Structures are given as C-alpha cells and as structure tokens.
Write a protein that binds this DNA or RNA. Structure first.
Lengths: 659, 659
RNA sequence: CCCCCCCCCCCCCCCCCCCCCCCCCCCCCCCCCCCCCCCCCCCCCC
C-alpha cells in the first residue's frame, strides 16, 4: 500500500485494516476489499483521518466507538456494503461529517431517528436502497443538508408528513430517480423550507401525473426540474400550468419519447433559460408550440425529431416561424435529426443566436442555394456546423446573409466542385473554415480572395487539384496561421505557394507526394517552398516519400519547435542542416532508412530537446557512425521512448539485433 | 564496316564503295547510303559476290560492265533507286540471277526488251513504279520466273497481248495491288501458261467488275485469289459464277466493307479450303448464304459483322442453321464482333470443328446457361475461347456438351460466383483452364472435383476466397503441373494445400500476403506448404512481404531451377538453406533488405548458376560480409546484369555508393 | 436448501483506436518501344 500523503488500498485484497501507517494520514482509502467487520480497537493509531472510504467491501455492521477515534472525520464513505441495520447511536459521536454516502446498503426501513445527532452534514446519499418511504426521522434535523439522493429505491408514494422533517432545510438537489411513485399528496413539497432542484429521471409519470406534479409544485422556489425518461409521450397546454407560479430556470424532457408537443404548452415558463428535449420522437412542430419561451438561452434538440421510415416516409416537418418566440436563444443544438431541409422561415425570429449546430440534421441538403439561409439574415450567428449533411454543391452567395459568421464547418460532406471564390462572399468576419473529408475540391487563383481575414484552413483528404497555379491560392490569406493540406496526394507545388505567409505557425503536408520536388535531379532544381516561414512552429511531413533533403530547406525556420519526418525514405542527410533550428524541441524520424547518426547533421538538432523518435531505423553499429549517438544517449535529458526496445542495430551482422 | 562472313554498311553514310574487303566475300550490303553512281571499275577486287544489296541509295544509272565482275551473282537488289532508264544491255551479261528487286525506281515505260538475256530469274519485283502497262518485252522470256510484282503502279487496263510474253511461264504469284485497273480483256489471263495466284488488294472493282473478273478467270489453274480491300460492298449469287470451272482453294474478301452477303453466292467453290472475311460490315447472315462451301477447312470472321450503334440498335443477327453447310470446317475465328448471343441452332452442322474463338464476340453473354452451347454437342471442339465476353455467371452443366474440350479460356471476364464444382461437369478431356482477370472467385472443397485430368490452372488476379479450406481444393488435381495463384491477395494457406501434387512444376504465388505464415512468431509455427514438391522447377514469390525464411522450407525442392524472392523484405537468411538446391540456375533477390552475403547461406546457391539478380539490395562493405561475395564475383561465369551500376554498398558511410 | 452483496481469476461477443503486410483503383514523374505530323540541312531525277 503505497502512501505519501494519502493511503490507497484499491484492489489489494485486504481483509483486515493495516496497522503500519503514518499517524498524520488524512485520507484512508480501503475500496474494493474484503473487510467483513470494522472493529474500532484498530483505529487508536489513526486519529487524524478526514476521509475514510471503505466502499465496495463486505462490512456488515459498525459500532459507535468508530467515530470516537476520528474526531476530525469529515467524509464517511460506506458505498455498497451490507449495513442494513441503523440505530440512533450509529452516528451519535459523529457530528463533523460533511458527507455520508450509503449507496447499495440494502437498507429496508429507517427505524426511529438515526440522523438526528449530526447537524453539519452537507451531502447525504441513499441510492440503490430498499426504502419504501422518504421518512428519515421523527423531529426536524439536517438543517445544513444541501443535497439528498433517493434514486433506485422502492418508493411508491410521497406523503407530506414523510418530508415534514425538512421544515428548516435547504435541499439544493432532491433525487427521486428510478422510483415507482404514482401518488402525490397535497402540500408534500411545501414541507421543505427551501426546495431548489428535483430529478424524477426514469419515473413513469404520464401526462396526467405530470400535470398533477406541476400543480403540486406551484408556488415554490424551484430552480431546476428534470423529467428525463419520464415516458411523457404527449404534452397538453395545461400540463405545465402549475409551473406559472414558480421561477423555474432549467427544464429537461430528454428520452421521454415525446410523440407530439402540444400547442402553447410552455406558455407558463417566463423565467426558463435552459431547455432540454434531446432524444425524443417529435413528428410535427407547430408555429405556436414554443410560445411563451421568450427567455430561454439554451435549447437542445439532438435527435428530438422522429427518424425517417421507408414504410410511410414520415419526415418530421417544422412549421414556418417556429422559433419566432425564442427571442433570447443563443445556443441551438439540432444534431442527429432528419429534417427535410431549411425553409424560407425556419429560423425567423432568432435575434440573439450565437451557436447553431446542424451536424447530421438533414436527410439530404445537397445544394446550398443563395436562398437556403435567408432566415438567418437577422441572426448574429458566429459558429455554424453543417457536417455530415451530405452537402454536394455550394452556389454563389450561399453565406451572404451570415455577415457575423466566424467559424464555419463544412467537413464530412460530399462537396465536389471548384472554388470560384464567390461561395465565401459575405463572410467579412470569418476566422476558421473547415472543409476536410469532402469529395473533391478544385482551387483557382482567387478561390480564397474574398476571405482575407481567414486564420485556419483545413483541407485534409479533399483531393486538392490545381494547387500549383501560377498565382498562389493562399496569397490573399495574409493572416493565415494554421494550414492543413494533408492526405490530398499533392504532387506539384510551386516555390511561391506560401510566399507572404509570415504568420503561418502550423503547416501540415503529411501523406502527400513531394519527393520529386526535393530531389537534386528535379528539372529546374529543388523547390524551396519552406522559405520565409519565420513563425513556423509545427511542421509535419509524414509519408511524403522523401529520399534526400536539400541543405538550404530549413535555413529560415528559426522558431521551429516540432518537426516531423517519419514514414519517409530518408537514408542520408547533408551536414549543417539543423543549425538554424535553435529552438527545436521534438524530432521525429521513425520508419526511415537512416543508418548513420553523426554530429555533423544531428549535432545542433540534439543540442536540447524534449522528445526524440528514431525507433524503426536501420542503424549501423560502427565507431564512425554510432559512437557519438550512444555517447549522447548515455548522458542526456531528452525523453526517448522505447530506447532499449526499438533502437536496434541492423549492420554489421555481428551486431544484428544489438541495441 | 564490321564483316566476318558478310559485309554490312547500313546507315554508315557511305558515298563510294569501300576498297578494303576480303576477296571471298559473298554478300555485300550497302543499304541506306549515298552512292550517286556505281562504276564497275571498283568491282575488280570483288569477284565472289552472290548477294549485292544497294537499296535505299541515290543510284541513277548503271553500266553493263557491272555484271562482268560478278559472274556468280544471284541477287541484284536495287530497291528505291532513281534508275528510270533501262536497255537490253543493262541485264545482258547477268544470267545467273535468282532475284531482281526494282521497287520505287520510278520506271515509266519498258522500251523494247530488257529482261530477255536472263532465263534463270526466279523472283522479279516492280512495285511502286510508274508503269501503265504490263508489257515486259516483245518475245517470250522469263521461263523460270515464279513470282512477279506490279503493285502500286499506274496501270488502268489489262490487255491479252500485254501478258502474251508469258506463254510458257509459271507465275506462282502475280501481284496487281493498288492499281487503278477498270477494264478486262478476253483471254488476258489465258496467255500465261501456268497461273497460280492473284492478288488484287486495294483495287476498286465493284460487284460488276468482280463478276467480270470471275468470268474471265474461268477454266484456269488458279489456286489463290485474294480480293482484300476491293470495295466489294455487295455480293450476288452470280458474282462468283466463273470460278466454278476452276479449282480455287484460298479466297480473301478482307476489308471489303461487305454490307450484305448474297444468298447462295459461294455455291461455285467446291474445292475452297481457306476463306477470309475479316474486317467487314455484314449486317444479316442467311441460312443459305454459306451454301456450297462444304470443303472449307479454315474460316476467319474477325470483325466480319457490323458494330452496334445506339441510333438504331442494329445488332448483327445470324440466322439459325447458318453453318450447317460447312461440314469440313476445323478452324473458326469470330473475334471482335457484336453478336447478341448464341442461339439453339447457331453452330449446328459443324461436325469437324476443332478450334472455336469467341474473344470479344458478343455484346453481353452474361450468363452461361446449360442450353447456351447446345449447338456444339456434335462438334468435337478442342479449344474454346470466351475471353472479353463480359461473362458474369456460369450455371451447372454449362459445358456438358463439350465432351472433347481440352483447352478452355474464360479469362478477361467479370465472372463472379462460387465454384460449386458442377460448372465443369462434362469435361472429361479438359487439360487447361484459364480463369484469370475475373471479378471474384470463391473456392470450395469440391470446386475442381469433376476435373481430375486438369494440368494447368491460372487464377491470377481473381480475388480468391476460401482457399484455406480444411480439404484442399486442389486435392483431386493429381496431374496438375502449372498452378497460378498470383495477385489474389491470399493471406491464409494451410500446410496441406499442395499435398499430393508431386507433378507440380511451375508454382506462382507472387503479389500475395504470406509473410505471417513464415514468421517464427506465427501461432502454431511456420506453415511448410512447399514440402513434397520434388518436381518443382519455377517458384515465384515476388512482393509477398516476407521478413524471414524458415530453415526447412526448401528442403525438398531438389529439382528447383528458377526461384524468385524479389520485392520482399528479407534482411537475414538462416545458414544452410540452399543446400538442397543442387540444380539451381537462376536466383532473384532484387529490392530486398539483404545486407550480408555469406558463404554459409549463399555458398551452395552460387555453386553453379546462369543468372543472378541482387541489384537493389543495401549491401554492407565489410570484410566479414562482402569479401567472399566480391571474391566470387572476381572469378565466376554467372551472368550478373548491371553488376557495376546497381550492386552498390550503403554501409559504412565511408564506402557509401562504392560498388 | 433459497434470494441478494462484493474480491480474485479464467473465457466469449460487440464497438472504437493503432501498427504490420498485401491487393485493387487512381494520381505525379521518369524511361523504353510503335505510329503519325512538322521543321532544318545535304545529295539526285523529271
């Protein structure tokens, strides 16, 4: 049991408490053990404990003397025990506890008054118990109790007198999840002095019982009310009438299989700010369905509509001016839906929208016409997600109405076209554009001429074509910092492609075909496309098939810190190639054909590093090529993973396999 | 001008005849030179010449004294000269010549009698001349002349008196190709004593002029008659009436753009044995169209039918019982056609067929039903070709009627199915089966159980599946000698796949994935699937990705002569692996990772060879690994191509690039 | 004999990620052949 400040005995197969520990220990963890009983005679030495986790054990019963030896104990964790018997003296001397977790204790019934003797308890948990009533005592106690759990119990009814013991208690979290509760008594929730949160998740209520609960919850200080997986199939206008007299701010209806949402149902929630309806089966949405929610600031509709069926083609249709009431909506999630498309008035009325997500939200939004996003003209949208919508074509002025757009994601689509440059018109504040994993893209001389403020440009695995045009397509991108052109099988690159991009920091060119551009036999000479990038930090050149590196390629990367050259065919490197890399930190040369590591080339590179990866290289165990390398390895501070497992010699055969 | 027995001066830019040659030279070749004139005063030394080729020169005129110095001259080759003037004395002293080629001499008119003085001439050529008449003299000469060319001339008519000089001459080949001849005179061909062959290729005759020619050719000893590219658009029953009185055996109508073949047209050729109709545009074939050809032994119909057109879908249709008259047909070529398919009576009546080719002959023969080849039941067919017919499915008993089939070719198709084994039923005499370049094949335990006599089996690039069944699919193939399983990406092979195939000689397994089966870390041990093949001769294992070879793999290949292991990842080979290869002749190890060549492993292999290919290997210039190799290279007889260009050292760097 | 609670260990299935090897298709470049066209120089014939 290793212990420097806290003691851990997780999965150590301990049966009895250890007797050799420092006296000043604060936390004693004995989880996942086989302690049948816990005598208090062995806790004389341990008198400074604050947290005592004895969960996941076979403890049957305890004794009052246990708390005598722990006067400063604050956490008494008894998760998943066999403690099914409680008495007044069980927690008598214990009064400074701030947590008492008793989950899966198989407690049947609270007998008289076990929790009276403590008053500073903050959190109490009784989940996975056999309790059938919520009574926890006779008189009033647990004044400072903030949260209480009763989930996974056998409670069938809630009586007012059962919770009368909390007449002066502020319950910030009252869990009643997974309870077979079907009856509500008048004034049951009014017994609690300060009620802030309810969680009736996985409780089969139904519209009638939900309406009764809403009526019973009227005129209280409730703040959060979650009804997840409540089997709330249908909603009526009077279902949430009782919530009018409250100040509810967060509501949840997730996984309720809500077949139809009623008309003007949520008119009684003027103070609602957070709304959750994900994973539902709404078939039709009415214009006045969302009436009265003019204060919500967060709406979640992930998979909130019914999925398409070939039997009837029942596509969930959203009526026009549906969101005209959500004036204060600022975050809208609508992923994993099957909406037929965007109409001329689908998003009208959203005057505060800031984040709209439509990932996999449409059955087939193949063409982005200039009138597709007309409804978002008055929405100051900043981040728009359109991934996995099977978009195949983008027309001119597609995003003309999104003047405030900053982040645009069009990846994971089938966008196949040529960027004429007018597709991005109207994006005066765009910063990041994602176009990776498309069908095919064809760049022109003015593909990005209308987005001079762009900073990120991801074009990974998009089959780039005509990137070697005489005018560089990235010339207008003066503020570009991150550029990704990987997995495009790029073959020809002009030497002026990256000219003028002094602010470029991360450049990815892995999984391309640029071997010919660096060979000295290339007609016209080697292509030096890595000149002037004084601010380059991360350079990735994996799987480019390079056979030789010209001497003056890295002559300008003074601020380079991470350089990747793995999976190439490098065999020999010219001397004085890493002198300019005075701030290098990580070097990657795995799976190459390097045989000699000399201080002529790797000297300045290995001046001071943090990572080094040259694992799968056929090194040569010779005094003129490996002596300096092993001498540097002997005394250094750089981290070399798998140094003795993969840095192996191949030649000569006398030293074949020798590290 | 190198010369050991004959003299060659081809493209040597010679202007005058050389004067330093052996006297006993027999052949003097001066082709492609710039000899303006050929004086006979320089031929005093050369008196033993037999063949004198002065073709492709600028010779203008000759003198009779030239033949005086060459009494034993037999070939006087004067191809492509400016000799446009002839006289009686030009070929006076020349009498022992057996060949006189005068093509492209720009001869306008034969004046009086230039060919009288010789009588032993055999071959005479006058192609590409400006002759307008066939007169070659006044009296009769050239008694022993066997062939004569008049192609590419300016002849417009053929008169009987023009060829009267051959009253006692046997012309075995009379070329009149590319002649604008439009008039035929009576008795023109009867002047020649023995006429055996005519070649009117590329002569625009037409049906009427063709009929006139046939009438004029009646009652002669003609044997071959070719009318290739004669613009014979249409044929009538009376077109070839005149050929009845002859004994014609070979006829040609190739490239005639024959739109329609007449009914009962060829009834006048009872002795025809060879028939050519390739590259025609026949649209409809009648049942009685081929009547009277009961003696033809070779029919060619390559692209003899019109191609399909989307405008009208005019697929060339063949009437039933079309070939019922060709009783003696033994070789039928019908490639590059667009026949809709095979009917129930397409090939009925062919009782002597031995070779049927249907490569790219059908528009879409997708399914080979059991009734597809019903017409071939009575044909003793031996070789059948069905390549490039886009066959996609084969049913049971497809080849049940082909009991005499020996070679079957089904490659270059889209055959995708699983071989249940009944597809080959009825092939009791099959020897070779070609199935390469199909869509996908799935083998079972009894895929080839009905073909025990098979000897060749090509399955190259067919995407073989389930080849690793517990019963080897090749078990019934006891007589199998050549097996091809390359380019199938085979991954798993059982050790008993080739058990019982002692007669296997050529085995191909290149472009597969068998690296795991030979690694010593493979669960269950390495797979020794090359045991018992004592008669194996050619072994091909290219691009299998092998990393190590178990010692006892080649312990049984005593008769192995050619072994291929290139394009693999071999780095080191265990000692005593090539001892059993006592009859090895060719070793291939190119593009591997071999670094050391030691006599422990390569000793017995290099005992006596003819070829060695270890070019693109990273050798190691060390006294313990390359000294024996270079010593063996210094004194040996094996052919090592590109020894000084690609056998280069890579390590140590002091000897980097040194051969 | 029954219903539950753990700790340890051994298997089965599914999903995700990564590595090795290989095939097919396509892209970039180079080389070797065949055909056609153009241009330049020189030598002849009518």
């Amino acid at each position: 049991t290793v212990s420097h400040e806290v003691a851990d005995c997780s999965h150590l197969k301990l049966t009895q408490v250890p007797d050799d520990l420092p006296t000043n220990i604060t936390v004693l963890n004995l989880t996942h053990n086989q302690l049948r009983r816990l005598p208090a005679a062995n806790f004389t030495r341990y008198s400074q404990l604050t947290s005592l986790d004895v969960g996941f054990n076979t403890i049957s019963k305890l004794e009052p003397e246990l708390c005598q030896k722990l006067p400063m104990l604050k956490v008494l964790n008894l998760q998943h025990n066999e403690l099914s018997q409680l008495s007044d003296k069980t927690f008598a001397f214990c009064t400074n506890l701030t947590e008492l977790h008793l989950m899966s204790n198989s407690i049947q019934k609270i007998k008289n008054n076990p929790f009276v003797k403590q008053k500073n308890l903050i959190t109490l948990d009784l989940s996975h118990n056999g309790l059938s009533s919520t009574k926890l005592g006779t008189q009033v106690q647990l004044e400072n109790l903030q949260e209480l759990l009763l989930s996974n119990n056998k409670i069938q009814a809630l009586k007012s007198e059962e919770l009368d013991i909390f007449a002066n208690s502020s319950l910030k979290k009252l869990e009643l999840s997974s309870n077979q509760i079907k009856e509500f008594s008048p004034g049951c929730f009014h017994a609690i002095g300060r009620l802030f949160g309810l969680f009736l998740n996985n409780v089969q209520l139904g519209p009638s019982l939900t309406e009764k609960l809403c009526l019973e919850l009227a005129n209280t200080s409730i703040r959060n009310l979650s009804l997840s997986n409540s089997q709330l199939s249908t909603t009526s206008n009077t279902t949430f009438l009782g919530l009018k007299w409250t100040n509810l701010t967060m509501l949840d209806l997730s996984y309720n299989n809500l077949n139809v949402v009623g008309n003007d149902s949520f008119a009684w929630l003027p103070q609602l700010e957070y709304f959750f309806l994900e994973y539902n089966n709404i078939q039709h949405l009415f214009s006045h369905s969302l009436h009265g929610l003019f204060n919500v600031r967060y709406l979640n509709l992930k998979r909130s509509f019914t999925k398409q069926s070939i039997s009837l083609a029942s596509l969930p249709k959203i009526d026009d001016f549906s969101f005209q009431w959500l004036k204060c909506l600022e975050h809208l999630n609508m992923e994993d839906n099957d909406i037929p498309g965007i109409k001329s008035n689908m998003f009208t009325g959203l005057i505060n929208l800031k984040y709209l997500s439509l990932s996999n939200s449409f059955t087939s939004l193949r063409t982005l016409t200039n009138e597709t996003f007309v409804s978002l003209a008055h929405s100051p949208l900043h981040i728009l997600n359109l991934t996995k919508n099977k978009i195949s074509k983008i027309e001119s002025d597609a995003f003309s109405w999104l003047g405030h757009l900053e982040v645009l994601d069009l990846g994971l689509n089938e966008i196949g076209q040529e960027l004429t440059g007018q597709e991005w018109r109207g994006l005066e504040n765009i910063f990041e554009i994602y176009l990776s994993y498309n069908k095919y893209l064809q760049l022109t001389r003015n593909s990005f001429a209308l987005v001079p403020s762009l900073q990120r440009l991801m074009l990974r695995r998009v089959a780039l074509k005509n990137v070697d045009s005489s005018p560089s397509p990235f010339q207008p991108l003066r503020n570009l910092t991150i550029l990704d052109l990987s997995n495009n099988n790029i073959a020809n690159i002009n030497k002026k492609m990256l000219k003028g991009l002094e602010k470029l920091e991360i450049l990815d060119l892995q999984h391309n075909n640029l071997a010919r551009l660096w060979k000295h036999a290339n007609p016209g000479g080697p292509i030096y496309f890595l000149k002037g990038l004084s601010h380059l930090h991360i350079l990735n050149l994996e799987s480019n098939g390079f056979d030789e590196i010209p001497v003056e390629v890295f002559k300008d990367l003074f601020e380079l810190k991470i350089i990747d050259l793995g999976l190439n065919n490098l065999n020999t490197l010219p001397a004085s190639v890493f002198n300019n890399q005075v701030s290098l930190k990580s070097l990657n040369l795995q799976k190459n054909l390097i045989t000699s590591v000399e201080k002529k080339v790797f000297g300045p590179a290995f001046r001071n590093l943090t990572e080094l990866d040259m694992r799968f290289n056929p090194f040569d165990c010779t005094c003129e090529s490996i002596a300096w390398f092993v001498n540097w390895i002997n005394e250094t501070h750089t981290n070399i993973p798998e140094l003795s497992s993969h840095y192996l010699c191949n030649t000569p055969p006398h030293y074949h396999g020798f590290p």
